[PDB]
Structures are given as C-alpha cells and as structure tokens.
Amino acid sequence: TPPPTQWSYLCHPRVKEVQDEVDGYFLENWKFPSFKAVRTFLDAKFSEVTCLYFPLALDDRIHFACRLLTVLFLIDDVLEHMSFADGEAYNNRLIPISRGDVLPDRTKPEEFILYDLWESMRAHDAELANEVLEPTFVFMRAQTDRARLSIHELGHYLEYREKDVGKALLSALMRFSMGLRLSADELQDMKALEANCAKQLSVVNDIYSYDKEEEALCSAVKVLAEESKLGIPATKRVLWSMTREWETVHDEIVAEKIASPDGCSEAAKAYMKGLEYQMSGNEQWSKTTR
Ligand SMILES: CC(C)=CCC/C(C)=C/CC/C(C)=C/CO
Numbered sequence: 001t002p003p004p005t006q007w008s009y010l011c012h013p014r015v016k017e018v019q020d021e022v023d024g025y026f027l028e029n030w031k032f033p034s035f036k037a038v039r040t041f042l043d044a045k046f047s048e049v050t051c052l053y054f055p056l057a058l059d060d061r062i063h064f065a066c067r068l069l070t071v072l073f074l075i076d077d078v079l080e081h082m083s084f085a086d087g088e089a090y091n092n093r094l095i096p097i098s099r100g101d102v103l104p105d106r107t108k109p110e111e112f113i114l115y116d117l118w119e120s121m122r123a124h125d126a127e128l129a130n131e132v133l134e135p136t137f138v139f140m141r142a143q144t145d146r147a148r149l150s151i152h153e154l155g156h157y158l159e160y161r162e163k164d165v166g167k168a169l170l171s172a173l174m175r176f177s178m179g180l181r182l183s184a185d186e187l188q189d190m191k192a193l194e195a196n197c198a199k200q201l202s203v204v205n206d207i208y209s210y211d212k213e214e215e216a217l218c219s220a221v222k223v224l225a226e227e228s229k230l231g232i233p234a235t236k237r238v239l240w241s242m243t244r245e246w247e248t249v250h251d252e253i254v255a256e257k258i259a260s261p262d263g264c265s266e267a268a269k270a271y272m273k274g275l276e277y278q279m280s281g282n283e284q285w286s287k288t289t290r
Pocket of ligand 1: 167170202206
C-alpha cells in the first residue's frame with residue numbers, strides 16, 4: 001500500500017547482542033508487577049526500535065540509547081497510571097538523581113537505574129551526555145497528563161507535532177549515540193530540517209496506529225479525513241503522498257545545506273543522514289509491529 005520511498009532503513013549491526021544485554025539488565029533490575037508484564041515488556045522490543053532509529057550509532061554507545069529509551073518508556077507507563085500530582089512528584093524525585101546531585105535509594109530500581117545510566121553516560125562523554133539531559137527532563141515533565149486534546153485542522157496539528165518533545169529527545173540522543181559534536185549555530189540552522197522530520201515521523205505513526213486507536217483522538221488520519229470528507233483508506237493514501245512529499249523536502253534541504261557556500265560540516269552531514277534513518281527506521285518499525 002505505501003507508495004515508493006527513496007530512502008532505505010537500516011538496523012544497528014549489534015541489535016541482537018545489545019537487545020539481549022539491555023532487556024536482560026531490566027529483567028534483572030526492574031520490579032515488574034507480574035510475569036504477564038514481563039511478556040508485555042519483551043514484546044515491545046525496545047532495543048530493536050532504538051536500533052532502527054539510530055543505526056549509525058557508535059558500537060560502544062548504542063546500548064546507552066537502548067537503556068535510556070527503555071527506562072523512559074517504563075517510566076512513561078508508570079506516570080500514565082498515577083494521578084497528576086503523584087506523577088509530578090515522581091519526576092521531581094528522579095530528575096535530581098538523573099543529574100547525579102542525589103544518590104539513588106538502591107532499593108528503588110527507578111532510582112538507581114537512572115542514576116547508574118546517566119553516570120555511565122557522563123563518564124563516557126560528559127559534553128554530549130549533558131546535551132541529552134535537559135531534553136529528557138522536558139520529555140519526562142511532559143508526561144504528567146492533564147488537558148491535551150481537540151485539534152481539527154491539518155495545519156495546527158502538524159505544527160503541534162513539529163514541537164513534539166520526544167522527537168526532540170530522539171535527535172539529542174542521536175547526537176550522543178553517534179558522537180556528533182555540532183555547534184550552536186549548526187544546531188539552530190537545523191530547526192527547519194528537524195521540524196520536517198518530527199512531522200513526517202508523526203504522520204507515518206498515525207497512519208499505522210489509526211485502526212488500533214479505535215475503541216472510543218489526536219491523529220492526522222482523523223483530522224484530514226474530516227476536513228476532506230474522505231474515507232479512512234483514501235485519507236491514508238493522501239497522508240502517504242504528503243509523507244513522501246515531505247521526504248523530498250528533507251532531501252532538498254539537505255542538498256542545499258551541503259552545496260551551501262558557507263560549507264557543510266562533517267558532523268552536520270552525519271546528523272542530517274541520521275535524521276533520515278530515524279524516518280526510514282521509524283517506518284520500517286511501524287509496519288512490522290505490535
Ligand atoms: C518518541 C518516543 C518517545 C518513542 C518512539 C516511538 C513513538 C513515536 C511512540 C508514540 C507515537 C506518537 C505520539 C507519534 C506522533 O504522532
């Protein structure tokens with residue numbers, strides 16, 4: 001069904017070993033509520049997803065990305081099941097520990113896992129480790145659920161997805177995993193390219209998550225289908241066209257930045273290529289999933 005795409009996804013070469021490694025660590029430390037929970041956890045294959053998003057990550061770093069994303073999803077699920085206040089408190093306890101300004105309980109996995117993870121990351125590359133720090137707090141604090149809902153125009157919806165705090169985290173993490181060292185200016189001039197990516201990432205997600213999200217809704221599939229009065233299949237076909245169109249915008253922006261007179265850094269190029277993999281990898285994942 002999906003129209004052709006100029007891009008080829010890629011999975012990190014060490015996906016298998018790393019997946020065992022990381023999943024194992026959590027089977028060893030996280031206090032799972034039950035065995036069914038463990039089954040659910042494993043079926044998520046967090047390390048595999050991470051490996052599809054960051055296939056160009058350095059071999060000795062890819063596991064950090066897997067670890068960080070895994071605990072963040074575990075945490076995200078926890079916050080979703082506790083009152084806004086309790087949730088807010090939960091993060092208040094972890095962020096200070098994540099910074100390393102507070103020792104972990106050591107009896108509370110949510111505490112020592114984050115603590116040991118950030119300490120090992122900072123020990124490996126403090127400069128870039130810190131680059132990922134604030135983005136993950138923003139992401140964590142955004143998980144305290146309240147309000148949120150009702151967007152009916154395409155524009156507003158796409159604009160809202162461009163600002164997604166998680167896709168922002170992904171990009172920061174991507175830099176750390178690949179060991180990319182960019183300048184403030186370089187990073188700023190990447191905004192547009194980044195927004196286009198965050199937007200593409202969301203729509204492809206919606207297209208594949210629409211059906212399952214049916215039971216009783218912030219989705220591009222719903223928004224457009226209403227505005228255009230088309231059926232779901234048609235809407236999806238249209239969303240795909242737009243998706244492939246945005247991939248061209250990506251390529252166009254890249255080519256332009258590279259061929260630019262002011263030149264394009266080696267680290268900059270790696271960064272842009274990296275974003276392409278998040279998108280190609282995100283789709284690959286989205287097809288074959290759940
Ligand atoms: C962005 C994060 C935290 C993980 C990768 C998988 C993913 C995109 C999950 C949520 C789906 C979503 C909100 C898509 C945007 O429409």
